[PDB]
Structures are given as structure tokens and as C-alpha cells.
Amino acid sequence: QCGLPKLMALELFKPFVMKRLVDLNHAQNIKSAKRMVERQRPQVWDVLEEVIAEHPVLLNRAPTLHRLGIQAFEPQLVEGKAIQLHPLVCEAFNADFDGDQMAVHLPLSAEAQAEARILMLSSNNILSPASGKPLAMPRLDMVTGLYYLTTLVEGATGEYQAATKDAPEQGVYSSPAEAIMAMDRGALSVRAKIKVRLTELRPPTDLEAQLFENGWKPGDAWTAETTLGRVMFNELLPKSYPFVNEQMHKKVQARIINDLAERFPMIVVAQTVDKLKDAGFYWATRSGVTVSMADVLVPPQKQEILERHEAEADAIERKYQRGALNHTERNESLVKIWQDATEEVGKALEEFYPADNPIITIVKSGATGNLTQTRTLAGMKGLVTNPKGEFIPRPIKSSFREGLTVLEYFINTHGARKGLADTALRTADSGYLTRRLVDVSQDVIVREHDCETERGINVTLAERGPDGTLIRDAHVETSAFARTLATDAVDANGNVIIERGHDLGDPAIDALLAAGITTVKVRSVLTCTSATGVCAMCYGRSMATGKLVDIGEAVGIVAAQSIGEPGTQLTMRTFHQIVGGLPRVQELFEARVPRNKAPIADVAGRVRLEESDKFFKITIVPDDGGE
Amino acid sequence: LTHKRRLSALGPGGLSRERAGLEVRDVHPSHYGRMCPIETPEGPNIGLIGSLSVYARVNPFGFIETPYRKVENGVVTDQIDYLTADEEDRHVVAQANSPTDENGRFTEDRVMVRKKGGEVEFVSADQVDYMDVSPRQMVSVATAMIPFLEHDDANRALMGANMQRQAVPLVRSEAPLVGTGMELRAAIDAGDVVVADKTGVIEEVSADYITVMADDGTRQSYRLRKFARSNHGTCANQRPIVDAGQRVEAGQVIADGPCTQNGEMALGKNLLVAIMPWEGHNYEDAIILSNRLVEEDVLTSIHIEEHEIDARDTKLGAEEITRDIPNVSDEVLADLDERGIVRIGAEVRDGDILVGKVTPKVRDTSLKVPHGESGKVIGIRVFSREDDDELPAGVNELVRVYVAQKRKISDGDKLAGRHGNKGVIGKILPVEDMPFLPDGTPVDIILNTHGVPRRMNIGQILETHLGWVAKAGWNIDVAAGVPDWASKLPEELYSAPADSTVATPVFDGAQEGELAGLLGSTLPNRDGEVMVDADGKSTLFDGRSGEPFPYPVTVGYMYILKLHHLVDDKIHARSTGPYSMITQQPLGGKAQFGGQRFGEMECWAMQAYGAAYTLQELLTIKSDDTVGRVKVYEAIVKGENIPEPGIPESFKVLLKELQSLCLNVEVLSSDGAA
Amino acid sequence: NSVPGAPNRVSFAKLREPLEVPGLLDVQTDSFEWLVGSDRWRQAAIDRGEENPV
Amino acid sequence: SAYDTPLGITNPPIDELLSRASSKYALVIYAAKRARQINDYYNQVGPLVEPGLQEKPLSIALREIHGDLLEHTEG
Amino acid sequence: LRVQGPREVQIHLVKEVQEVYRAQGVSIHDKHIEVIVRQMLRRVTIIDSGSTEFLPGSLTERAEFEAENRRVVAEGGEPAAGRPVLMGITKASLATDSWLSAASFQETTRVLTDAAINCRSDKLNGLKENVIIGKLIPAGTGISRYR
Amino acid sequence: MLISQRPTLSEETVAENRSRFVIEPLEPGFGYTLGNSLRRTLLSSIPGAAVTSIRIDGVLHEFTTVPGVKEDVTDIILNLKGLVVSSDDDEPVTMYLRKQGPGVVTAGDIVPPAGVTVHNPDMHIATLNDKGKLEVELVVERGRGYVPAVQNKASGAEIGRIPVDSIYSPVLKVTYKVEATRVEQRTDFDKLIIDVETKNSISPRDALASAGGTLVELFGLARELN
Amino acid sequence: MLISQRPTLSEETVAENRSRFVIEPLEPGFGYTLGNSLRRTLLSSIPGAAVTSIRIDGVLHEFTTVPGVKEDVTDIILNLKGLVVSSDDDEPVTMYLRKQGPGVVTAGDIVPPAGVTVHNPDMHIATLNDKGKLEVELVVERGRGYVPAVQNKASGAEIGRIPVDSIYSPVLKVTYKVEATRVEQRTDFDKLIIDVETKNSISPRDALASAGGTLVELFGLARELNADSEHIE
């Protein structure tokens, strides 16, 4: 759902409302229905509410960096000029509410309405097409609320106790509702450890087989050694989803939503994310997270560290004045020492802050921010650049809590204006690369189900290493994960592990690792032999849907957008006017001769090295006996 | 005031936004004390437009020079020299904040100084040639008006300085509780306030004029601008502050301007703010407001629109402004006068008549209220060649109608503090729904926590704390002795009553310890209760469920500005209308009922979805096709199926264009030529 | 102070300002007075030590 | 597994409809052609299922698809 | 390309691009990089015309090259000899087969002259030329299978 | 541990317009919600009277001056916002004000008709010099909550009549405290204290009575059913 | 003054012990005026009897487990906690349950005194091993709401006494929501929804009616000061 202003909706749906004015005999002549709607005579509004029903509208924010920049929503009429946007789709639009504007479009034909309702509808587009990871999931306030809800604190009221020859456990409840009653009276803290008899929540796999010979069913009681908040969070998940009993870091919520998307219908996860949104907002409102000058703690170790590094700087000053050191080399040494000082102060700040302080709570919860910003806030700003991009040797030892001195602030302004100025150039470079990728990917469409070729590419799944064990590659999620197998995985004894043509997901990865497989052969578009476009089997599954890509879907434009959209996160070319990032990406896609070129062996053999004073000479004696 | 002091690098004989590199945009160490490093536009004019520093003046050759105190033998002296950057590079200049004991000698033996390389160093105290005259020698006027500037990041300080300039005047102005020393001089030098030229006594006071008798015995009369329209449409009302018979000295403010209270500038309102998330209605920087602000017109503003219509002549004769428009209903011209001009004080609706005019063919060509506009007709101005009006050729009459509209704060309107903490009002809550203090006072505004830590503008928090210390009084006990934290406070700051305004200049003001001590020393409320603890937090109550929040929340007073980005004219909608002619695509314009652009990136997104039919609608029916448009509109009106498009209209023109060049272009079926 | 009607805004400042903030519109008015060769500008120039300013 | 009451355009669930077509793209035209037929009936087989007060033809077509009241042949 | 061959070149290009992205903490799946890289190695330069109609030295789509080679060899002719060529995305875009799309962003008169004397037929496989014509894009809802 | 004792309510005055109402005993955790319900009703729905439109002799619209008066019409309306009145009947009532020559036009200068009175005659409205003549016709009406200025062309068709926003709420401030005055700590109770302050057009007792009457009818919905 | 229209109250049943009530249409902002207080009265302001203490033979101290029964002492305490007891006398009642031999002991084995009743006899209390036996004496009494385990400082004169949390409220769970509805061109009127789940000693309808009557009287305390100037419906 999305909220539309009443006047805006009236003007958008003008002919559609006029039709019902004539049909309801609120107006006799359509040429008079035009005037009736244009004057906003009070009868039209109630017509609009029925014309607007179940007619979706397309919402778009500029720039449209990828597919999810346009999403369909069900319009609800609302008072006021502002469009009401669902908080979960904001990250897909890259939108925030400091002034941004969005455009609204109305599909007319039956085909267009069906496309908006089936293809572009927001509830059907949870996962990112670039990586398959969820995007419409808790953020900011909601992450903080759930993290507070599911955190376990020790020493709180009503917590579990052991039998002590004088009283029973003193921390057990017959049902979660009894714990709710205890919480409402202030006897039990939501974050306190307790034991609860659960009958509606599925136990963990470790407990299910141990407690139920034929599996758990609703109504079967078990004892959960978990906080009340964790139980309340688990009640938001599907009825058949095992109890998690964990602190809901953003990563853990992403894992749970991944499980839901992979193993449950789309509507189920769509409803689950809404429930998590509601709970997160509630417990964010009631988490107590606030900022005050008292909460911004300064580590007491700061001054000792600063004095030590000042002694080091004085030693370098003595050595420079003694003629043993160059000006530029003095700058280098001072920069490195003050970088060490910044790291020391960062560690001191991170170890000094209490775990439950709001400032560190927001960062460590994964809601937003990072430790560098916290160090700048309460530690020391550190080194800042001059207009030429060189570090100024003398750091900003003050923090924004203390307030900078005049010259510290003045030297700080340089990099700030640099960043403000170069952002448009960064955006332009990213857009140019994206445009070229789109232009080259114009005709890559899934044309057929299968080309039936047996070609493929090798993917390493793990390395045996010293222990001969299952050290899976960390980046496997982007190489083997989500692809069709080209040939059966076979063990040393000749038995297969996974059939040809299977979708290589996480269960398949676990099965392969458990069977000792380190390398597989997988189908790829590089080897697809289809006469036109590509075939579905060689492409594999759509990352957004998690199922085999449908015939006709334009994988080329999706790939171009996926590559180009994160372009601004890469290190850019110099605008001061070898560093990697976008400059090398453009180098690779243009097939240009590398500036930092390295020769490669033409033939396999043994190397005879004939180094010179400032050059190298290498000869390869081929093992084949050739030249 | 900032526009008059603006420095522009782009213009005739200068540079341009199109190709000016970052080198000219970058801040330079020579800018110190001459050009403000903070106050510059954020768009393509970044770095190209700046502001003159407050203490800077222009060398007769055109070079900017700034004043410095002379220093010799480690003792500062009162001689002031205005140095250019070329002159300054030949000297060592110390930091103004450097401590000096009796008769000017530096207390410490090492001093921060600026050096020709644009460098900063600890030189010997006897190695200094000059010193800055003020800590804020580098800032401009708008930058100097940000309290706790040094606690805010440069980007957010820039945003706050820019936003101060786009704050709309309010119906009643209120000076900030927490301010700088700069508001008064900035307001006086802006010139919107009326100032007595010579000492005297007030003889007359009226809403329109003020009359003074000087000690010379001569008499002066001052005229006040009432409800005058500004270039941007904001109200420029001037108000008298002096009473009859009052002593008025030369230079004393006699009438407030649009954004001044008692002479000092007042761009916003002091609101009771609580720093907490709240039910997700302030998510992603959205703002929650109490309905009180709407009820009491705390954030209400007046805007005046100006409409023109001129009666001219043509080959087929002259044009007439007249009430006798053909075929218009008798009531539609009721509010019009005998000449056909709407009377003053009439409430005019969207699309209503303002001035009736007809032209030969006669035709209806009357001036009508634009889409969405409304208000009260506040004024009429008329010009005729019979009165030697000096209008251009080919015009016989001209009429200007002024329409006044009073706008309350509403959803979607932008608000912002002085620290760059901009936001959009997402919800307005009834007074009983707002979280309220144990005293019963409901907070006016709720600002989300998750904004402050990442954006690095804690100066808004500090102000908030000091704001409370300004609303509630404070009293430092001195019976036994001055507390150590208060040992740097002047004796005048040891106590102050409630609602007492304070000044915390941008680089010489309240320190952290002083603010904490003052928080500990606040007076109790009416009932004798200390509402906010020493840490600036309070035990708020939930206005809906009624139970207290489980943790104390930061509460205080913050100065909030209403920005000119109001919703009333930021909204657009269209369903067919006027169209371009040389090529048949829609128009684009705020007041021209134009449609939204569909760029190639949006087409890429549609292609990625594979929503072919929607893309076709956007490409052909909604944009270029004429026949398709008439057909689809009549289909919607008739409630029948939208026809599935056949042969594209662009293709048929392209085919004939190709054929005209002797190219045989043929449509081929999958089974053969056709 | 130099502003008779100034409200009493108590200041936290520690350092004194040895120089008052100049006329903030002088950048416009002094330049225009130079353009029209006003008497005030001429007197100011000869006070500054300029030789027969024009 | 189970799911809560689908609100608004969510009903019928997208997965139930998708199970009756080779792809979402196929489902789009499967619904659009039927909606055109229903609208033609209203203008001139008609809706096979109980309509609402002002229900749109697309909703009727989707609810008929959910009920397995229709058949189709791809191109 | 000259040492290890075309397939290894595609693998190497994907490896390098994904290494650059990984070093920067980005999470693009390899298959998008492969979709892009497939176009960079889509054409072959012909050495000998053999018994085909192909012009020597001309660029030819690999699929068309193989189709005509198998046709002629099944009809007794010597198949044309070809050399894989690696192309940047810019040159790969310039080497498009559709005369409509080429006319839309290249020197239009040259494109039209070349297409006219050669009597080229445009198959409208790409989205760009279909947008140019004003027809339904040949992807998703617009393909014959679903229309 | 069941309790047979029923709550009781009492008043303690602190000012002519302010009093604290004590309710005790109450079940634990129960005071806050009851107090909040009463507070919401008090702030929202206690009826009152306010001005709804005005006319001035020389004024055609709100954005104008009037000769001889220091304040413009907008300031005059914003000052009238401080006027507190209480008509005893719901139908609109037209008050009149006339002044000539020097002086301060206060709210006591208003000459109201029977059944309506101005509770704060000391309030300042305007200042008149020698030439100042002020004639004001005010329309009071009874209502609830807050209603924006009713559009002139909608309520009627009288030109020169200028609407004004209306606040129909005689309640000024409301708060509550809940304290643990439990019975000897053998069992738990909450004690509720509700501090109510009004604009002196209605006493705290009557406003709280109105709030209770409003709340009982809404909560009676459940009593009707079986 | 009268209002636009008086609300109507409707009901739906998820299960025989779980209802959902819906007040609609409601004046803007009174949903939060009603629902929270209604929930609090439902939870805390309905009287009922519950087990307040127990004593099991063989676990006089070192309260971990009792032989002859697989359930631990805490599990048996939990089972007894769910026991739906009802008593028509305000003073405490002591009751006894005794079983021997293999099988299961359930709430139905209890034989309450006159004026005392058990509404969930089928509830499983414990499972008895071969030749095992279990005897337990329960102290039951009346109250409202929920009460933590008794402080029992006065103990020591008797051994094996276990204080247990007392669930007196016949209402088990309540949860309320507020949503928007339209009555005219106006929007944002309140609709109040409330789920009520109760022990089978009471129906949700009875709990809601009793809570509503309690609130009516409790706020009529206020209108006992005066009657004038209220809403009339």
C-alpha cells in the first residue's frame, strides 16, 4: 500500500471518476461531469474512493539506478499533500524524508494493470536482483527495536534461579501470557532470562528430535530457556519455523529473512516483514535510545596516549632539526605516528563504553553508523587532508564533543568541500559506465529453456589444506551459489552426490562439503551454445525470485544495472587532475592493454633467471623439449 | 544581507558552472578571514559562490584585506593593521584565543600560528608578528548565527547556514533563547528594521507611521511597510515597538522587520523538543509536531501572490477590460466591480475570475486564479495610458491583483534547525497524544535519535540543553565559594530568571563543564519540581497508553525554522491537457500543468521488469500519439477496453521518410515477405 | 554595545572583541560612493593618506 | 504452510496464481485476456464467479484463475 | 587470448572484475559479469572464405559462422576459417548487427547506405530497435510465447 | 487476597482554577491508564465557547491596518485569541465593542449581552491614539475541541466578515501522579492524583464531571450486551 | 451536544475461548482512550480463584524431583498453575489430591469441597511410574489479576510449603489495535479492535461485559461531582 493525496488522486483518476458520475447520475452530461470534478463538488470524493480501489499505481524516485526504482502499490486516499511511503521500500528507492520527492504514474490498459499487479508489485520484489539478498527488511529504528527486544541482560528482575534448598527455581512460567502478566506488573523484565512452557512455537531442531520421536506439532509442550522478548519475537515468525533464541543483529535478521524467502511462499515473507516492522517500531520507541551530552563518553586514556605520541613527535622534531631527516619524510613519520594514535584512541573508546550506552548501541546493533564516526564524535577527529589530498601532519586532536579550535576547523573544511564538489563527477562516471554496459547488453534475452549442451566452467568449492578438511571459499556465494550443475558430483568411490541439472543452493553446498567435494563443474552463460540470446538452464535461477529464470526475461539489462548501481562505492579516478576500482573496471570491460602490464608464460617449463643491474631477463626451458 | 555580501566567481568575463574545475572551487589557506569556508551553495555553484567574512573589507585595488592586532616582543598591542593575503604571507599570525596576562604578554611560551604554506605550528611566543582580532574572524554573517558551530561537522554547518537564508517569515517573530551576539547587528544592518536617525521623543505611534521630535526641536516621520509583497512572495510587514512619549535615542530600533523581535533577528520559533524515536512516525528524519503549533499559529506564515493582465490593441482593434463577458453566468461576475476588477476583500477560489477582459475575433480572455491557488484579494493596482502611465507600446491598460493567503504548518512541509537537521513533517499529533512531562506539559516536537550520531551535529543537542537552561532559570550557589566548573563564568552568569535569553558565540561560548553545571543548577518549575535532571533528561509519559517510558528522554528547547519548500506548490498532477506543437509531446512547468518526464533510465527499469505493455503506454499513448490519446481517453470515458495498439504511428512516418530517399523498406512476416 | 535598544542577552564569551563588526553593507555603499566621487569617500581617502584621490 | 488473510490486491496469493502458469509473464496475459473478455461482456461467457458491488474485471479474472475455471494455450 | 584461448579469456576477465569488486566490498554475483563478458567475445574475424559467402577479414557472429560452416560442410564445402577476437564493450556496441540500432547512434547515412546495398534484414531481437520502431519490446510480456 | 473496598474520589484545591483529585484504592499498575484516559477526555472533549467571526468598521479583510490604532487587524485577532468566554447557550451570540480617542482597549471594554461574560477583562486587545476609533462586532459560539476558521463563502455570503480559528477547550493543563500508598505492604494498591487547571471559565470539578460523563457512555457499550 | 453517531460493538470468534471485539465507528483519537484501560480492567479487575500454594510429599526440601513420577517438582508446579480452580468462598481452602499405581494423574482426580469446582479435569498433572504414587495438598483462594510467588517470610513452622504465582484473572490474554475508517468526506475516524482470550471459567463476552461495567462505575465516580456538559448519545 501507498498513500495518495485526495486532490492528486482526483486529478489522476479524472476520466475514471467522471465515468461513475455519469453512471451514478450525479451528472447528466459528461461535458458537465468535467466541470463537476474540476470544481471538486463534494459528491465526487465518495466516487473516487471506489474508483481508486484495487487500481495500482507506479511509484518512481529519481535517479532510477536499478529495477526496484519503480514499484507498484495499492493507493489509499489520505489527507494532505504528501505521499505516504512504506518504510521498508525506502531502501529500494534510496529515499529518505528530508525533502525528497517521488513521481506517480497510473497504468490504464488491462495488460498494464496486470503487469503492475503481478510484476512490479512491491510485495513481490523483496529480494535484490543483483545478489538475491533481501532489501525490504528492518532498518534503523526497527533494527534497534528488535535488537533491544531480543537482547539478554544479566541481573534483571524476575530472572531464573537455581534450586537452593530453600525455594524453587523462582523463574518459571506456565505460558508466555503469564510472563506478559508478570511484565505488565513490573515483576519481570522483558530482557531477563526465564524458563517458559511453550506449546505454539516449534522447538529448535536440536530439541525436536530429542523431545518428540515423531516430530513436534502445535500444542505439544516444551520448556524454553529464553527471555520473554525472544519468545515475543519468535511469535512473529511462521507457525512452522523453529525457535531461534538469538540476539537479533541485522545479520541474524537477514539470515532469517533469507530462510523465509528460500523455503516459504512470497506472501508469507511479505507478511512476516510487516510484523517485524511493527514490533521493531514499538520496541524502538520503548528502547530508551537517546542522545545527551552525558551519554557521549570520552575515554580517560586519551590524554596519556596523546602525550606519548607528542613525545614521539618531539623526538622526530629533534631528529629533523639535527639534519637526519627530510621535510617530506618528517611529514610521513608524523602522519604514521598520529594514525597509530588514532587507532589507540579508537580502541580505548570502544573498550570504555558500556555495552548498553545509546551511542554505541546504535552502532553495534547494526542499525546505522560505524565506529569511526563514534571515534570522531568522542575520541579525536584525527588527520585531515589539504586541498592537494595530502595529510596535514598535525592532527585535529579535539573531538566534536570538546569542540574544535578555530584552525582545526579551518583545516577541516578542505576535505569537506572536496567531497561536496566531486560527488557529481563520481555520479557521472558511474552513470557513463552503466550506460555503456546497457548499450552492450541490448539483445541478451532468455530465448529458450535449454540448449542441451554439456559445456561448463569449473568452480572451486573448498580447499583441503593441511587438515584435509572442508575450508569452503568465503566468496562461494557469488560463484557456485545459485547455478545449474553441468555434470554429476562424484566421490572417490564412484558414487554420485548431486544429480546433473540441479540448482546449486545452500543445501546442495552443505551436501557437497559433507561429501568431501572441493570442485564442481557448473553451467554458465559463457559456455551457453544457444544460437540467440541465452537459455534458462545456463543462466540458472533469477536472484530475485529464487527459481529458474523465466523465458523472455532480459538478463542483460538486469546485469548491466546490477553492475552499474554500486559504481559510486568504488574508488574513482583522480579529479585533482595504480589505484583500483572503477578506473580498472572500465579498463577490463574495454579490453585495453593494462598500464601495469605483466608478461605471461607462453609455454610450460623451467625458469632460468638472468637478472641485470636494473632490468630482468627470463628464459623458459619448455618441459616439452620445444624452443 | 547575504546576497549583498555575496562573492560570485561566475559571470561576464569570469568562469562558468559548465567547466569550472575543482581547483577554483577548493578552499584555500589564503581565504582565512576574507572568504567564508562554510557558507556556499551545495549544487553546481559549489565553491563558485561565497560570502565575505564579517571583518573583511575591500582594498581600493579590489583585494580583500582583514584586520590583525600587532604583536611584538611577545606582548600584544592595540594597533590594528588591515593586511592583504600577499602582505599576510610575509608574517606570522597567532590564534586570537591565545591566552595573555596583564598588559598583553602571552602566558605560555608556545603559540599556534599560521604560516605561509597555509600551515599551523607551535612557534615560540616571541616569534609572533600578528594576532587575529576575533575567534570568528573567518566566518560570514549566516555562519556566525549558528550556536556551537565548532561542535558541528563542516557539511552540516554549511547546510544550516544555507537553510537560515530560506526560512520564511512567520506571522509573529520570536527571538531564539540560545543565540549568538550576531543577531542584533545582522538585523540592524539588513535594514528591514526602522531606526531613529536622531535622539528625540515619540510624538505619535500608529500601525502605519511613527512620529518623533528630536532634541533639536525638528520633527521626523517614519512610514512602515504593511503587508507588502517581497520578491519571493513572503510578507514584509513592519510593526511599531515604541510607545507614545518614549525616549528614543539615535540608532535605536523603532519598528521591527519581518523576522525581528526587539530589533534582533528572529527566523524561527523555540519549540520543546524530545529526542527519541516514536512509533516510526519520525523514521528517516521525519518530524512529529504537536497540533498546538497548528492551533496557536506558532508556525503560520503569510504569502502574497501577484497576477497581471493588460488590455492591448491588435490589427482587429483594441481590447476591453469589462464586466460584460459573453456567456458567463451572472454569479461568476458578481464579485467584480464596474470596471471588471474583483473587489478587495473577496475570497477567490481556484479558477475564479480576477479581471474580466475580452478581445476581438468577442472572446473570453479574463484573468483567472491558477490551479491550486486561493486567498483573499489584498490589493489592486491599475495603470492606464490616459494617466501617462509610461507603459510600453501596444498596451492601453494594466491591472495587478494581489492575493493574500495564510498558511498553517501542514504535513509535508520542511522544517530545519540551525545545524542542518532538516526534515519533513510526517505526522501532526493531538495535544493529548504527544508525550508529556510529569508537569503535564506536552512536548512540541519529536526528533529521532538515529540522526544525531551519524550526521555529526551534536551542536543541536547542546543547544537543546542550553535551551532548557534558558527557559528555566538557574542559580549557582556561592555561599561557601565559587564551584570549580563555574570558575570561568562572569559574575553576571551566576544566576538568571526564567525565559532569559543567552548568547554563546560560535568560537567563544559555553564549554561542556559549564553547560553540565548549569543543567545541575536549573530553577525548579512552578510547583517546585526539577523537571530535567543534570544530564538533560526527563521522565516522559506516553500520551496514548499513559504509562511512563522505561527510560528518561533528552528534553529541551530548540530553535526551529520554517523553510520555503512548502507543499502547496511542490505538488503536480496531470491527465491530458495542453501539448507541444512543433513536436507533440506534453509541456513541462509548475504553472503550465505539465506532465512528468520519463527518462531512459526509467525505460531501462521497465525493460528489466519486462512490463512491455506499460512501457508501450508510456512511450506512445501517453507521450507522442495524438490519435491514440483521443481514442484512449474516450475509451476510458465510455468504460470500454483500451484498444490494443496496432501499427505504431512513429513507424509509419519513419517508413515514408526512408522511402522518400529511394530506400525500399519492407515489412517481413516470419513466413515470408509481406 | 553601541546599540541603545539592545535587549540584555547575557553572553558566555570570555575574550573581549577589541574591534567592532564593521558596517555589513559597506562593501556595496563604499564602492558606489567611490563611483560617484562622494565627499564622504574623498575625505575618507585623504584621511587614509591617498594622494589626490579621483 | 499457512498464511494470514490476504488484504486488498494481495488476494488471491501470487503463488497460487503462479502455480497455474509457466511464468509470471504468462500469468500476466492469462489475466489480461480474461479481463478484456469480462469487460466486453459487461459492455456487450461473462464472469464465471460471484462479482462484488464494483469489483474490477482483473480481480474477477484472477479469482477465476485461482479457482481453475480457465484454460489457456501458449503461442 | 593468443596463449590460453577464448574460454580462458572470459574466465580471466570475470575473475579480474570480480576481484576488483571484492576488494571494494561489493557483492555482485558472477553471472552478471559473465553476461557482460559474453558480449566481449561474441565475434570472429574470418581468415579464409572457404566455400561460404563470408567476406575475408570481416567480423562475423560466432553463431552465424558455425551455422554456415556446418551447412557448407554438410553440403561438401570447406568451412570458413575464423579467429576469435576480444572486443571492448564500446567496439562490441559499434559492431551491432541491427541497422536500426546502428542508425540510431552511428553516422546514419553510412549505416543506411551499407544496409541498403547489402540488403540487410533486421530481426528486431534487441529492445533498442523495437523502441525505435515503437513496437512491443521482445522481452518478458512482449514475446510471441506470451502475446 | 481479594479486596472488597471500592475506590473513592476527593478534591484538594490549590488555586481558584486548579485542584488535585485523589482516587484510592486502585489495583496495582492501574492508576496510569485511568489517569491517562481522564486526561485525554479532558484535553479533547470538554465543551466551551469561543469567538468564530469578527467585523471592524473600516476593515474589508484581515490583512489591513485601521487608522489611529497601533496594532494591525492580524495582531488584533491574535490578541483576541487570548479572550476566554462562556456562553450559556449553544446558539451564536453577537457582542459589541466601541471605543474612541486615546486609551487601551481591554477585554473589559466589551459589553456582552446576557448569558455570556468575559472572564479576563484585564486582557489587552488594542491601543488607540487621538485619532483611533475602534468598532468590533464579535460572534461567539459553543463547540468542542478545535475548529479552523470557517470559510466565509461556505458559512455564509457576508463580505467584510472575517472568520477566526476557534478553540473550544476551557481546560488549560492536566497531569497525574500515581504513588504506592499500599495497605501496610501486605498487599498492593495504587493511588491516583490528577492535577487539573482550567482557564477559569469552568471549575476543575465541572470539567472532571464532564470528562467522567463522557467516558461512562463510551464504556457502557459492553453493558448493553448479554 | 450530540455527536455524529454512536459506536456499534461487534464480535467474532477465533475459538470457543478467544473472541475479537470491534468498536466502530469511533471519534478520532478515543481508540487509545478506550482500549488500554479496557485491557487493563480485563486483565486485573476480574475476580477469580487460583492455587496460591502447594505441598508435595517426599520433597519436603531439596526441591528437585519426586520419586515415582517422571515430572520434576517445577514441572508439577507448572501443571498445577494451569489448573482452572473456582471457589465460592473468599477465605483460603486447603484441598488434597492423591494417586498411586502406574498411569497418569489428571485434574479430574481432584474432589473439590462444596462450592469449589475444577473446569479442566482433562488437564494432565503428572505421569506415574510402576508402583509409584503422588500426594499433593493445594492452598487455593480468591483474588484479582496476577500475583508473584508469596514472600513467605512467615514460613519455617511448616516444611515443604511452595508458594506459587497466582493467576486469579479469568482472562488469559488481551491485545488491542486501532485503525482508520471513514464516515464522511472526513477521514481518520477510529476503529478499535481487541482480542480477548480467557480461561474456560468465563467467556470473553462475560469478561468484556464485566470490565465495561467496572469502568462505567469507576468513571461515574467522576460524574458524581456533577452531570452537566457531557456527551449525549
Ligand SMILES: [Mg+2]
Ligand atoms: Mg533527501
Ligand SMILES: [Zn+2]
Ligand atoms: Zn545454454
